[PDB]
Design an enzyme around this catalytic site. Structure first.
Site, mmCIF file in Angstrom:
data_model
loop_
_atom_site.group_PDB
_atom_site.id
_atom_site.type_symbol
_atom_site.label_atom_id
_atom_site.label_comp_id
_atom_site.label_asym_id
_atom_site.label_seq_id
_atom_site.Cartn_x
_atom_site.Cartn_y
_atom_site.Cartn_z
ATOM 1 N N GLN A 128 -1.931 -0.931 -5.367
ATOM 2 C CA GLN A 128 -1.737 -0.102 -4.187
ATOM 3 C C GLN A 128 -1.578 -0.966 -2.943
ATOM 4 O O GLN A 128 -2.214 -2.017 -2.811
ATOM 5 C CB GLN A 128 -2.912 0.858 -4.005
ATOM 6 C CG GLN A 128 -2.710 1.862 -2.882
ATOM 7 C CD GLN A 128 -3.818 2.893 -2.814
ATOM 8 O OE1 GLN A 128 -4.812 2.801 -3.532
ATOM 9 N NE2 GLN A 128 -3.651 3.884 -1.946
ATOM 10 N N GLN B 228 -11.642 -2.491 2.723
ATOM 11 C CA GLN B 228 -12.089 -1.520 1.737
ATOM 12 C C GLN B 228 -11.145 -1.558 0.536
ATOM 13 O O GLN B 228 -10.332 -2.475 0.386
ATOM 14 C CB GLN B 228 -12.163 -0.128 2.363
ATOM 15 C CG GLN B 228 -12.928 -0.074 3.677
ATOM 16 C CD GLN B 228 -14.176 -0.936 3.666
ATOM 17 O OE1 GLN B 228 -15.070 -0.742 2.842
ATOM 18 N NE2 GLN B 228 -14.241 -1.894 4.582
ATOM 19 N N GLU B 229 -11.248 -0.558 -0.343
ATOM 20 C CA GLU B 229 -10.366 -0.509 -1.505
ATOM 21 C C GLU B 229 -8.903 -0.537 -1.084
ATOM 22 O O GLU B 229 -8.074 -1.186 -1.733
ATOM 23 C CB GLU B 229 -10.660 0.738 -2.337
ATOM 24 C CG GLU B 229 -10.048 0.708 -3.729
ATOM 25 C CD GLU B 229 -8.650 1.297 -3.769
ATOM 26 O OE1 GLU B 229 -8.420 2.336 -3.117
ATOM 27 O OE2 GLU B 229 -7.780 0.717 -4.452
ATOM 28 N N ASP B 230 -8.565 0.161 -0.002
ATOM 29 C CA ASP B 230 -7.215 0.166 0.557
ATOM 30 C C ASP B 230 -7.261 -0.577 1.890
ATOM 31 O O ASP B 230 -7.421 0.020 2.954
ATOM 32 C CB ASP B 230 -6.704 1.599 0.730
ATOM 33 C CG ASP B 230 -6.063 2.146 -0.528
ATOM 34 O OD1 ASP B 230 -6.268 1.556 -1.610
ATOM 35 O OD2 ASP B 230 -5.354 3.169 -0.433
ATOM 36 N N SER B 231 -7.105 -1.896 1.822
ATOM 37 C CA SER B 231 -7.137 -2.750 3.003
ATOM 38 C C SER B 231 -6.937 -4.191 2.554
ATOM 39 O O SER B 231 -6.893 -4.490 1.358
ATOM 40 C CB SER B 231 -8.450 -2.606 3.777
ATOM 41 O OG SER B 231 -8.373 -3.261 5.031
#
Ligand SMILES: [Zn+2]
Ligand SMILES: [Zn+2]
Ligand SMILES: [Zn+2]
Lengths: 115, 79, 59, 343, 65, 257, 44, 523
Positions: D223, D85-88
């Site tokens: 991030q 996902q966006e953070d992965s």
């Protein structure tokens, strides 16, 4: 600690059947082959060959989860034919298909070595 | 009689009735409906509600202190 | 902070905004123009104490 | 110091540059050279701290080149199997088996036997079940005759590594066990005398952490992204030349919580590796430009924009979209799943 | 700390190439020219040699126990 | 209702890699065979390591692990050897493993590094590929590294060290005849080596009917297994696994009936 | 147990309840050579 | 039984309700269960396993309330259990867990690795296990995720999947339909039977739609004049979404059509069918699209940021024109020619005029950048579908970053009448006051970088305090309305029993089932 053993991907679990054939009641002449301890290397081998057979109406495979290391294959054929025969017959063609490839490779490998 | 509450059964009432019945079933409580191999206690109670056999009677306390005894079978469930 | 060499260098050159009446009345968190060439603008811890802690410019 | 190591910070968003400053400090790597002699409560050292392909001129003065805190990775930006996902992020299992991001962990245990009271004092010895009245269920064979575990002994789970007892007015066991359940091997043992003159010792327990699905990996900017899933070399999307990307990140991060410098750095990394020259990462150098980098890449039989045709590992048919793959520098953050779960 | 045995991407051996890589650098050869001699056509392997740091050199300075 | 005939020809054969083209084959078979090289192919690599004395700067775990990544020239020994699990052993034997040893000591002032040549193996044929040279560690004066290691057969999927393929370049339809991949600007993209097209033509015209064929293979070996023998083992290894499925499959039908 | 001085790197036997000091140096920090009980390492 | 916190990772295969948990964490957690004859053997085997094996019981409770530890296993007779006992068997597959005052329940699935798996559709969390059966039944009936209610990695692919250009061969269709749980088992007839079968993306998605739900939506890139034109029903760009009998006859799906909103496929299905069917709709979309994404593929690269030279000249020309216009405004104020508006002063009026010129340039140049991107361009795909990013983000990457306002105004004169030492004294030009005319791809000048940092610093400070203040409001509001509830007389009352509202919402209807509509008897 929590890391699964590396050999569980291919190693067969004790007291676990490698192949299980389950009939599907949604559509007549349909069966599910829930193979265990296998990856996409084997799923695509049989799916493509099954499609080549005219008597196959629907054939495919999928993996419920990559970590599970078990592949599910669904095969549906005509009333005269059977999904079990399709799975068995397709495998024989692959063995013959690879035998010619392996045999022909050994024929051509020596040709290049000598010139 | 003279009950003014909605005939339908609220979601909260359904959840508690099944939960309490399921707990009772797990405590060797009898089952009114026929058993067809359903091991999980929640499933046993779920079909009991469908067949309108749960003996539990819901006593809805009105804000004024009055109470109305509404049976699970009498209440209209949504399936 | 000895986790990384870069972190060690940054900590040694670390700066702290004034506390008390002087810091409260002003806006130490906000980036000012005077920091050009003296205090690194990008470098600042993230959180409630954002902009209070900074790092000295390289030169 | 932390902002200087960022290529094209001008190309990068201001919050991202600020975010990297925090991430850069949290990055694990060789902090100094004399790590073996010293004893630190927390010290993460990378197996293969490699200098980046894209480096800034100011990086030389920081000496970060000598002691880097990350390893380069051929990152293909694609949505593979939807596990990122966006953070992965998605890693390559085969690469990790070769030492892609593995690092060591050092935890120093420190204890002293001091004569605080005239009647009761601390001593170092094996807490035998007979002489000791109060004790905790644990294996004590690790300790030696002096009450200190010798270097080279594997320690796992709850185990006593230093023997200490108090002669209460019969003695009560007060030894120190492992802080966590991690399996580690003692590296070195030190016995000294504190300022008060009492015997004082320090021991450094060394454990090896293998990157897994729970470890958090962060690029030089943007991030941090947790390793959503690890795939073997076969399952990874290989290109025409047979180069399975080491790491796959979610393309949807680039728009907002990432910077175009990642794409530019990938383009520079591809040119740097192909041409065998370390790229210049000066923030305000007019010589370096996106168009110039693209032209250089085209001379080595590669797409000017860095896009490449990646063949899906599972199905051999070509992917309709041409993935963008480049050697982007990456660093491993201290945040690891093993520490949290073992606690 | 030390050069990895093989490329993390494909698996080609790169540790043995490190010794020859340094020897070629002092032989007036260009940084990229040395990689071609060693036989690193892929850019993944060229990364392992072009931008590698041998930290063990400084560690060996300290005397052992 | 049957399979085709996979005609195969070899382009160039060398020690590092072999290039061959397989024609009249399904895409799934060709793609699967590519990953069969990486994972299914078994090779012998160091897996069990025990150190008797380690005074080097590097740590015990790092030094012991590095040995596994070193390939071993197991051409025919791997075939005759068997996995430890299926053997009748509780401890490694020559029939289900091989012996490895490395006893070195540095006493000269000049820095001395132990490489794969000093890695002694009981089996004369099972030796390191280099035996320039795969350096293991650098040893200072007064530093010694004595340890014993063992190597066993294992699948590539089990660990990367058991992967003899140093990057497999599998290609098909280089000219993009079937438009399986669409380029926004095909002119910019470079021409592949295997493609047969003119300079002024960006890509071949799309054929309404066609199937993937003429797969190009370039298997690069790390030196453990010769690239001309990996294919032979891979094809036999893939099909022997396929046959095993049939044997279990017959049992399931026997149960249903 | 047998220890090693951190300055001269020489073996010096130190017993229980004994001052920690090197005879050849007087150095006050001592180390432990190694354990004779070997462990098993797996290349993973 | 609070568990140890662990990081979160995504898992598309798992259902949204299901949650992945490691063996180690589940081993520590225990679930007391009352043994019954129907499952007496099940507890008998699990207790025999022991604590060393994961499927075991930490403790066994007798009728009298005595707890016997299974770690020791002193006597086989003590291991044996009688009816009515309570066994603290370790958590296994199918158990219900609850975690983040509204909490959503989940069905635990055991996975090999350590990190938790959640089918999002990162931050550490601790999952709580309801020991009592009564609350466990209640949680699974009202607190489940389906009753509580898509990732950005799917929505972008959904828009591409439903495009008319997409055509699926027989082989590809087989894989997509296999992951479809709500499949009747019959392959739909191909749209293009000859010369070769080719299923369109909509046909595959038609089976994904559950039952028969009809709704009309419009794509993000839907021209206004298209609806008024004769081609309203036959959309030239397939920008109109129409579904009949559960079949997507036409239209490209996106966040507007498939994403949560007042009117959307997920929203319509929830009201028409319910929550359980709606969850399968989410799972089918995620699974099927992910498999197709392996064939189509989504990526991003420099080529997306690199625009045609024609647009670069226009962007620079607009930037140059804006810069010259700002100078002209400055010259007018310098010569006193500028006249302040009656509602503002000269100094503020000048700041307003210059801001509009710079603001307009960013929007005009940014708008041209949006048109510059081609259909194949990856930047356009994200914004067109509306999944992630925004048109402003592309503008700052390609056309121009824009003005860097600080505290609602341009860069202040930190020094004596000059923003930075390099700029001359009393300089009100674009570069001096923080106007960033360089896009991220091109690279900012050293002056712009610092001005960009000043603007970014304000956002970080505002974000840091925004979360602290906003979180305070949430807790305060809940406390003042925690006791507010709807009683059995269809009235809203608090703990004190005071009537807050005669009927909930003044109508007496739930806020979830209500749907937006426009009655046409007043307009
Ligand atoms: Zn490589
Ligand atoms: Zn044996
Ligand atoms: Zn000494």
């Amino acid at each position: 600690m929590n890391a699964p053993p590396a050999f569980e991907s291919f190693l067969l679990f004790e007291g676990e059947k490698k192949i299980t054939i389950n009939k599907d009641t949604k559509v007549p002449n349909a069966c599910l082959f829930t193979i265990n301890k296998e990856d996409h290397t084997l799923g695509n081998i049989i799916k493509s060959q099954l499609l080549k057979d005219p008597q196959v109406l629907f054939a495919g495979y999928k993996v419920p989860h990559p970590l599970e290391h078990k592949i599910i294959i669904r095969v549906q054929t005509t009333p005269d034919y059977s999904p079990q025969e399709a799975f068995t017959n397709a495998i024989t063609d692959l063995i013959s298909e690879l035998s010619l490839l392996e045999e022909r490779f050994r024929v051509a490998i020596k040709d290049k070595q000598e010139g | 009689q003279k009950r003014i509450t909605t005939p339908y059964m609220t979601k909260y009432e359904r959840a508690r009735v099944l939960g309490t019945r399921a707990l009772q079933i797990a405590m060797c409580a009898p089952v009114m409906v026929e058993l067809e191999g359903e091991t999980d206690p929640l499933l046993i109670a779920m079909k009991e509600l469908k067949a309108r056999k749960i003996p539990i009677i819901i006593r809805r306390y009105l804000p004024d202190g009055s109470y109305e005894d509404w049976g699970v079978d009498e209440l209209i469930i949504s399936d | 902070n000895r986790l990384t060499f870069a972190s060690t260098l940054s900590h040694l050159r670390r700066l702290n905004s004034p506390i008390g009446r002087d810091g409260k009345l002003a806006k130490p968190r906000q980036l000012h123009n005077t920091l050009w060439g003296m205090v690194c603008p990008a470098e600042t811890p993230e959180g409630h104490a954002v902009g209070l802690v900074k790092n000295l410019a390289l030169m | 110091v932390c902002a200087s190591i960022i290529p094209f910070p001008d190309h990068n968003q201001s919050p991202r540059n600020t975010y990297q400053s925090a991430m850069g400090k949290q990055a694990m790597g060789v902090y100094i050279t004399n790590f073996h002699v010293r004893m630190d409560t927390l010290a993460h050292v990378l197996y293969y701290p490699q200098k980046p392909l894209v480096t800034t001129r100011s990086m030389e003065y920081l000496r970060f080149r000598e002691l880097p805190a990350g390893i380069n990775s051929i990152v293909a930006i694609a949505s593979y199997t939807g596990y990122n996902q966006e953070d992965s992020v998605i890693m390559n299992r085969s690469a990790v088996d070769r030492g892609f991001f593995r690092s060591v962990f050092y935890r120093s245990y420190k204890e002293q036997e001091s004569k605080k009271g005239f009647d009761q004092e601390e001593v170092f010895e094996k807490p035998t079940r007979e002489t000791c009245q109060g004790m905790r269920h644990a294996i004590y064979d690790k300790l030696d005759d002096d009450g200190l575990i010798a270097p080279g002994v594997r320690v796992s789970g709850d185990d006593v590594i230093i023997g200490k007892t108090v002669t209460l007015p019969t003695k009560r066991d007060c030894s120190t066990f492992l802080r966590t359940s991690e399996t580690g091997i003692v590296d070195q043992v030190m016995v000294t005398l504190n300022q008060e003159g009492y015997k004082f010792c320090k021991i450094r327990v060394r454990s090896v952490r293998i990157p897994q699905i729970g470890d958090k990996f962060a690029s030089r900017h943007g991030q941090k992204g947790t390793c959503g899933i690890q795939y073997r070399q076969e399952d990874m999307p290989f290109t025409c030349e047979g180069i399975t990307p080491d790491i796959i990140i979610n393309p949807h991060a680039i728009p907002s919580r990432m910077t175009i410098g990642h794409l530019i750095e990938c383009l520079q990394g591809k040119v740097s590796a192909n041409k065998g020259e370390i790229g210049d990462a000066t923030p305000f150098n007019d010589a370096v430009n996106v168009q110039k980098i693209s032209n250089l890449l085209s001379d080595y039989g590669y797409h000017l924009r860095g896009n490449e045709v990646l063949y899906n590992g599972f199905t051999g048919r070509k992917i309709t979209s041409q993935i963008f793959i480049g050697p982007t520098y990456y660093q491993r953050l201290k945040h690891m799943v093993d520490d949290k779960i073992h606690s | 700390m030390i050069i990895p045995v093989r490329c993390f991407t494909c698996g080609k051996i790169v540790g043995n190439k490190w010794e020859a890589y340094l020897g070629l650098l002092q032989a007036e050869y260009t940084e990229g020219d040395a990689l071609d001699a060693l036989g690193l056509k892929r850019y993944c392997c060229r990364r392992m040699l072009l931008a590698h740091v041998d930290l063990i050199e400084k560690l060996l300075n300290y005397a052992p126990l | 209702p049957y399979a085709n005939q996979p005609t195969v020809r070899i382009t160039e054969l060398t020690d590092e890699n072999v290039k061959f083209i397989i024609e009249n084959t399904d895409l799934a078979v060709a793609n699967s065979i590519r990953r069969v090289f990486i994972a299914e192919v078994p090779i012998i690599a160091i897996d069990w390591v025990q150190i008797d004395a380690n005074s080097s700067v590097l740590h015990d775990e790092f030094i012991a692990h590095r040995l596994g990544l070193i390939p071993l020239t197991s051409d025919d020994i791997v075939d005759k050897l068997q996995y430890s699990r299926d053997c009748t052993c509780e401890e490694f034997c020559p029939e289900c493993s091989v012996e490895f040893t490395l006893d070195v000591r540095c006493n000269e002032d000049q820095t001395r590094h132990v490489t794969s040549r000093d890695l002694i193996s009981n089996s004369p044929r099972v030796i390191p590929v280099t035996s320039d040279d795969i350096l293991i560690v650098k040893l200072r004066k007064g530093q010694e590294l004595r340890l014993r290691a063992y190597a066993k057969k294992g699948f590539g999927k089990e660990h990367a060290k058991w992967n003899p393929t140093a990057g497999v370049a599998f290609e098909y339809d280089p000219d993009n005849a079937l438009r399986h991949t669409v380029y926004p600007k095909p002119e910019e993209w470079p021409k592949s080596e295997y493609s047969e097209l003119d300079e002024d033509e960006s890509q071949a015209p799309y054929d309404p009917n066609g199937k993937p064929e003429r797969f190009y293979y370039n298997v690069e070996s790390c030196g453990s297994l010769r690239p001309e023998t990996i294919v032979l083992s891979a094809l036999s290894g893939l099909k022997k696994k396929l046959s095993d499925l049939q044997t279990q499959l017959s049992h399931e039908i026997q149960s249903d009936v | 147990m047998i220890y090693i001085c951190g300055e001269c790197h020489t073996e010096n036997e130190i017993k229980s309840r004994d001052p920690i000091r090197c005879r050849e140096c007087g150095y006050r920090i001592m180390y432990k050579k190694r354990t004779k009980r070997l462990v098993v390492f797996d290349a993973r | 039984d609070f568990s140890a916190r662990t990081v979160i990772t995504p898992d598309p295969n798992l259902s949204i309700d299901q949650v992945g948990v490691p063996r180690s964490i589940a081993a520590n957690m225990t679930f007391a269960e009352i043994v019954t004859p129907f499952n007496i053997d099940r507890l008998q085997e699990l207790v025999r396993r022991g604590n060393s094996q994961y499927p075991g019981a930490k403790y066994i409770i007798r009728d009298n309330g005595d707890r016997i530890d299974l770690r020791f296993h002193p006597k086989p007779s003590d291991l044996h259990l009688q009816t009515g006992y309570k066994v603290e068997r370790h958590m296994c597959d199918g158990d219900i867990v609850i975690f983040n005052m509204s909490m959503m329940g989940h069905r635990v699935r055991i996975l090999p690795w350590s990190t938790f798996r959640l089918n999002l559709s990162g931050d550490e969390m601790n999952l709580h296990l309801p020991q009592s059966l009564e609350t466990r039944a209640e949680i699974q009936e009202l607190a489940m995720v389906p009753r509580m209610i898509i990732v950005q990695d799917t929505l972008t692919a959904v828009r591409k999947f439903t495009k008319r250009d997409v055509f699926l061969e027989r082989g590809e269709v087989m894989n997509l339909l296999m992951f479809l749980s709500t499949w009747d088992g019959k392959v739909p007839q191909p749209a293009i039977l000859k010369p070769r079968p080719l299923w369109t993306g909509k046909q595959i998605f038609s089976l994904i739609i559950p039952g028969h739900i009809n709704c009309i939506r419009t794509h993000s890139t839907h021209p206004d004049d298209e609806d008024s034109g004769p081609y309203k029903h036959i959309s030239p760009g397939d920008t109109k979404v129409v579904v009949e009998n559960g079949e997507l006859i036409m239209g490209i799906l996106c966040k507007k059509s498939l994403g949560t909103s007042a009117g959307s496929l997920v929203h319509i299905s929830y009201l028409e069918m319910g929550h359980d069917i709606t969850r399968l709709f989410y799972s089918n979309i995620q699974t099927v699209i992910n498999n197709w994404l392996l064939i189509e593929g989504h990526t991003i690269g420099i080529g997306d940021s690199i625009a045609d030279s024609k647009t670069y000249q226009d962007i620079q020309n607009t930037i140059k024109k804006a810069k010259q216009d700002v100078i002209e405004v400055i010259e007018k104020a310098h010569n006193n020619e500028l006249e302040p508006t009656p509602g503002n002063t000269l100094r503020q009026t000048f700041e307003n005029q210059v801001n509009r010129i710079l603001n307009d340039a960013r929007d005009k140049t940014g708008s041209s950048a949006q048109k510059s991107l081609s259909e194949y361009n990856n930047f356009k795909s994200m914004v067109v579908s509306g999944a992630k990013g925004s048109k402003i983000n592309i503008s700052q990457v390609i056309a121009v970053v824009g003005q860097q306002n600080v505290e609602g105004k341009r860069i202040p004169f930190g020094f004596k009448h000059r923003t930075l030492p390099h700029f001359i004294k009393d300089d009100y030009g674009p570069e001096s006051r923080g106007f960033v005319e360089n896009s991220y791809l091109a690279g900012l000048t050293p002056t712009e970088f610092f001005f960009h940092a000043m603007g970014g610093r304000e956002g970080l400070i505002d974000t840091a305090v925004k979360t602290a203040e906003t979180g305070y409001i949430q807790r305060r509001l809940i406390k003042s309305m925690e006791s507010v509830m709807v009683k059995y007389d269809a009235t809203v009352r608090n703990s004190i029993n005071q009537v807050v509202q005669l009927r909930y919402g003044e109508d007496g209807l739930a806020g979830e089932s209500v749907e937006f509509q426009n009655l046409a008897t007043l307009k």
